[PDB]
Structures are given as C-alpha cells and as structure tokens.
C-alpha cells in the first residue's frame, strides 16, 4: 500500500503507512504530524480537515456524522471526501490513497 499527503499549496510529502495504521501515525515520524490532525487519533480538534481523493475515502471506515459535528464547524468547510486524519487507517486494501490538507491549518 501506499499514503501521500498534500497541502492546500501543492506541497505533498509521500510515505508508506503500514497496515493497521493511520496517516497520523505515519505523520509523528513521515513528517505530516505537523501537516495533519493534531488532537491525535482522538476527535477533539478540527486541524485534520484533510481532503481524500475519491477512491481511497471509500475503503476507509463510513464515519457517521457523528464525529462530524466537531468537523463542520471546522476552520474551513466540509464535503464528504474531507475526513479527520485521525479516523482513516491505511490498510493493505487502499494504496495510493492521496490525501489532501484542508483550505486552512487551524
Ligand atoms: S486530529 Fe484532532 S479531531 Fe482529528
């Protein structure tokens, strides 16, 4: 598999995230800890806005609304391609995902 993250900017560090992972853990070390979520794996922040392509959102998990809720009134504004890095693991099924930072970085 395979986990390259982007930046509103352009700029995208690319990584491999080992499978029963998420892209914040590849983040601590691949770098995207600083252009990823922040709270961690935990859902109490809105930094990790990040923007999935279209293909990999799918193998990822359904997360209701739920966790939403603290992601709409994110600092930047939501579809339903944008995911909190810190819900979304890389598994052997997705490789390539490309994922992608929000508009802003909290
Ligand atoms: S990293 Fe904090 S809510 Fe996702």
Redesign the pocket.
């Known amino acids: 598999s395979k986990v390259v993250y982007v930046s509103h900017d352009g700029t995208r560090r690319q990584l491999d995230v080992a499978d029963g992972v998420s892209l914040?853990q590849a983040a601590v070390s691949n770098g995207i800890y600083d252009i990823?979520?922040?709270?961690?794996g935990?859902?109490?922040?809105?930094?990790?806005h990040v923007y999935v392509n279209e293909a990999f959102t799918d193998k990822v998990p359904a997360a209701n609304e739920r966790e939403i809720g603290?992601?709409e009134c994110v600092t930047a504004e939501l579809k339903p391609n944008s995911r909190?890095?810190?819900?979304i693991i890389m598994t052997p099924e997705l490789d390539g995902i490309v994922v992608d930072v929000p508009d802003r970085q909290w």
């Open positions: 914040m990823v979520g922040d709270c961690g935990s859902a109490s922040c809105a930094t990790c603290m992601l909190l890095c810190c819900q």
